[PDB]
Design a protein around this nucleic acid. Structure first.
Lengths: 80, 102, 153, 60, 130, 104, 111
RNA sequence: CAGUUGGGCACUCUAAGGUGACUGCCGGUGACAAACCGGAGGAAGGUGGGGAUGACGUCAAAUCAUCAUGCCCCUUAUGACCUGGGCUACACACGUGCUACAAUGGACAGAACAAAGGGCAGCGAAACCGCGAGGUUAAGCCAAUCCCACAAAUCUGUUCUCAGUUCGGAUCGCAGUCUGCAACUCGACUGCGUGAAGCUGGAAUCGCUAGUAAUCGCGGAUCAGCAUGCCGCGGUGAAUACGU
């Protein structure tokens, strides 16, 4: 993105407006990988597509703009 | 100055259709008035583009097909509106491009 | 295939030099002949203005003391051969002198390879040094085996 | 997978940057000529048999 | 309208010049730029001036050379080749010795096209030694 | 650099890797010192009971290799090594020639 | 030393003198040093008793050594602690900023 | 200000027909023949330079994955559809290239020289904006007219001065642009910063007979983006071939 702007997931934007709207929902799968974490979508758990199964990622406060699919591990390590 | 001269430029695949077909295209310019200009020869551009001439291996042993397409031009001087509208009776060739550019 | 000879060059910029025209033909490296013409003309003004004397006499005495005579032509029956004595021909004379004076003098290490190369040719003007030391070097290796490999070729 | 591969490559793309070029006579990927409208093997065989003017080759 | 002098257009490596040498005094600056204005200096200007220095060495008439094409040896060598041939059109008997001092033939040494799998039309492909 | 071995249609068994590796240890058991030797081997008895082997050893400044067929597939390795016998003795003798003489 | 930077130049070029400290470089030294107006100038060590302090105000207003190492600490240490996709290659050993792992590897692995 | 514009078709250039080089001619050498040495003349001399053109056969060489096809095997899955990932991983060895290790160099200022190809689902002029990459709108070009476009090595002055540096450039951080459904695995470009290792590379190995090597740039096929590859294009302009 360059200027307009940070590209939200859409489906993750609906789940973030809903679960971040109220009640502070618990972590489930979220098969998207496109955008980052959001301002209001913090706190939750993204069990995003690690390729085989999910991986519980924290909705932290340090990775403000960092990619929500970047927190997961892509290729199975390590290693030799 | 002059008038905006009526002359159709020719485009052809090979070079003999523009030559001979430009000849009979000057045969349309003999009648219809007068002042049919001669063979203003175009730049005669080509295209050279080669592909890998093997099935799977042999990446060095390529091959280069290249097919050029350029033809001459003709622009008449004297107006002759009856022959100018009479230029639509174009009979030849099979492969040739006529377009009255005036 | 036979002896297929080569062509020479025309007269130089300053002034009408021909063997020094071959000196400019060796004077460049990597094609850009303008930089070689500049460094060569700088050697001409550096050695003809500084160290007050002429130009064609100075180069004629440097390469005139640089153009060797004998040389080492290898051979053998196999292992442990004998480096035969093989004297130079004329164009091999000027070519070998251009090789020794160029490849020795441009690798000196002064402030510039142009003025420092002129200093290497000027030290070569004393009949010794880098290029004259090489002419004595090959001139000394041959005639060390000039009593055994002489009449073989 | 020639039928689903070439037939799916004939269908409508997903995004606008999804439509990738296909093979002309044989639906191969990998360098179908966009200006001659044929593949490499298709341009070679169909061009040598007579397809448009013209040959091909060996200037330059 | 001027004196009957050279106008001979000849090429050398894709740089054809049009030398127009009138009855003059030795002014060789073509296309509005002098020899020290077009491409200085550089002591190869003597090589681009030698062919006028050979046709009895020399006139010297004027020099007006419209040279467009090639590079340094293209524009310069085409200028000397054009004033050499058209300079052969200056004096009618100049081709006796001027035809024997070089001064013709427009060497045409342009680049060779590399084949399918060559490096630079002389650079070989590669070697996998071992 | 020495002794990489791979093979299609088959395992990369260490009782095949040391089996080829000891037997190819004869040449560098015998020569001076090299760093070389990539090996290829595969096939079976799908048709006409075969096992192609082809072992290359381009170390002594000009290449040398061989090739043989068998069904037994261990007994073609021996018939690759003793193929390399003459190629590695005739690399050294042929070149180790002392027929040199001047005026005798 | 020096009167402008910590471990500043001495008897050296003015643009390279501004290109000494860990953060003061060539482009920015030409920029803010160009605002001061040196250009080497005076090319060794003599700018001014009031000009070099002009590099203390114009030269002092920017940064930063400990702030560059601290921003790097919050980057490789920030993402090294807040995740991440830049951490596993930020200290994991493999190529983080993009490369081939069978590549030259003269950033992390080597040979 | 501008071949730009009345004018002009001399020159250059454009592609058709031809002409021109074929041992043609002369002196010889040579068993007269074959050829070969030398010279004139010519733009060009002994198949002018280059390309296309690859003999039967060899390697059960490469390709059932460009395509087609004998058999075997699968078929409510070895088939078909979709999201994400991978093909880009990484103790390590290679293979081919790029950029360097530097003063014939490095940074700047000014000037000069090309050829070739593409451009309508496109090229994009000028103008302003942004250091910047690029943004905005928009004349023109279906293109020997217009655009891509400015060539770069090179020449003239300042300066760095022999040192891991005012060389070189990775790595990596922050900050922007463009492309796209989306640039974190995984596009490039730009800014500021950072400044690895390298001071011409072992045994060994390579390509090269002149517009060649080497070297400096440009265009294009793929292609939304993505070149240090590939294919063409021009610029600077070498040394040597004693001989088998």
């Amino acid at each position: 993105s360059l200027k307009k702007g940070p590209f939200v997931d859409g489906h993750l934007m609906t789940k973030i407006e809903k679960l971040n709207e109220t009640d502070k929902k618990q972590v489930v799968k979220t098969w998207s990988r496109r955008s980052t974490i959001f301002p209001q979508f913090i706190g939750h758990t993204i069990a995003v597509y690690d390729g085989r199964k999910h991986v519980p990622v924290f909705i932290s406060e340090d990775m403000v703009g960092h990619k929500l699919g970047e927190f997961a591990p892509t290729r199975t390590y390590k290693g030799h | 100055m002059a008038k905006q001269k009526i002359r159709i430029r020719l485009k052809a695949y090979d070079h003999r259709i523009l030559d001979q077909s430009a000849e009979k295209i000057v045969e349309t310019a003999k009648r219809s008035g007068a002042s049919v200009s001669g063979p203003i020869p175009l730049p005669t551009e080509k295209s050279v583009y080669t592909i890998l001439r093997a099935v799977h291996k042999y990446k060095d042993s390529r091959e280069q097909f290249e097919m050029r397409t350029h033809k001459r031009l003709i622009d008449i001087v004297n107006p002759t509106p009856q022959t100018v509208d009479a230029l639509m009776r174009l009979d030849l060739p099979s492969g040739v491009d006529i377009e009255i550019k005036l | 295939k036979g002896p297929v000879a080569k062509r020479d060059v025309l007269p130089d910029p300053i002034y009408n030099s021909k063997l020094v025209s071959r000196l400019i033909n060796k004077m460049m490296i990597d094609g850009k002949k303008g930089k070689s013409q500049t460094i060569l003309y700088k050697s001409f003004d550096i050695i003809k203005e500084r160290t007050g004397n002429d130009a064609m006499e100075v180069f004629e005495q440097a390469l005139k003391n640089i153009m060797p005579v004998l040389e080492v032509k290898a051979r053998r029956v196999g292992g442990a051969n004998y480096q035969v004595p093989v004297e130079v021909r004329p164009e091999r004379r000027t070519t070998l002198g251009l090789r020794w004076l160029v490849n020795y003098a441009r690798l000196r290490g002064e402030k510039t390879m142009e003025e420092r190369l002129a200093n290497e040719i000027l030290d070569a003007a004393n009949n010794t040094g880098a290029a004259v030391k090489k002419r004595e070097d090959t001139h000394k290796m041959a005639e060390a085996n000039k009593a055994f490999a002489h009449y073989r070729w | 997978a020639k039928k689903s591969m070439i037939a799916k490559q004939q269908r409508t793309p997903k995004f606008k940057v999804q439509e990738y070029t296909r093979c002309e006579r044989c639906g191969r990927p990998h360098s179908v000529i966009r200006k001659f409208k044929l593949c490499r093997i298709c341009f070679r065989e169909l061009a040598y048999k007579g397809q448009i003017p013209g040959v091909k080759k060996a200037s330059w | 309208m001027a004196q009957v002098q050279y106008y001979g257009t000849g090429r050398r490596k894709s740089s054809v010049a049009r030398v127009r040498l009138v009855p003059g005094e030795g002014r060789i600056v073509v296309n509005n730029r002098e020899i020290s204005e077009h491409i200085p200096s550089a002591a190869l200007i003597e090589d681009i001036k030698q062919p006028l220095t050979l046709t009895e060495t020399a006139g010297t008439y004027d020099v007006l050379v419209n040279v467009h094409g090639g590079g340094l040896s293209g524009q310069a060598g085409a200028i000397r080749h054009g004033i050499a041939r058209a300079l052969l059109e200056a004096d009618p008997e100049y081709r006796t010795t001027l035809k024997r001092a070089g001064l013709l033939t427009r060497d045409a040494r342009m680049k060779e096209r590399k084949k399918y799998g060559l490096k630079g039309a002389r650079r070989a492909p590669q070697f996998s030694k071992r | 650099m020495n002794y990489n071995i791979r093979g299609e249609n088959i395992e990369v068994t260490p009782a095949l890797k040391d089996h080829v590796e000891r037997k190819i240890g004869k040449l560098e058991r015998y020569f001076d010192h090299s760093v070389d030797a990539d090996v290829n081997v595969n096939l079976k008895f799908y048709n006409d009971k075969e096992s192609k082997v082809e072992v290359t050893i381009p170390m002594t400044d000009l290449a040398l290799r061989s090739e043989v067929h068998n069904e037994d597939m261990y007994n073609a390795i021996d018939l690759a090594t003793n193929k390399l016998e003459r190629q590695i003795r005739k690399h050294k003798t042929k070149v180790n020639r002392k027929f040199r003489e001047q005026e005798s | 030393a020096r009167i402008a930077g910590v471990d500043i130049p001495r008897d050296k070029r003015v643009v390279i003198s501004l290109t000494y400290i860990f953060g003061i470089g060539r482009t920015t030294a030409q920029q803010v040093l160009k605002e001061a107006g040196v250009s080497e100038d005076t090319r060794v060590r003599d700018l001014t008793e009031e000009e070099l302090g002009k590099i203390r105000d114009i030269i002092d207003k920017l940064k930063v050594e400990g702030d560059l190492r601290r921003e790097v600490s919050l980057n490789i240490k920030r993402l090294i602690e807040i995740g991440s996709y830049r951490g596993i290659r930020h200290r994991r050993g493999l190529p983080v900023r993009g490369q081939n792992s069978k590549n030259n590897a003269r950033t992390r692995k080597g040979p």
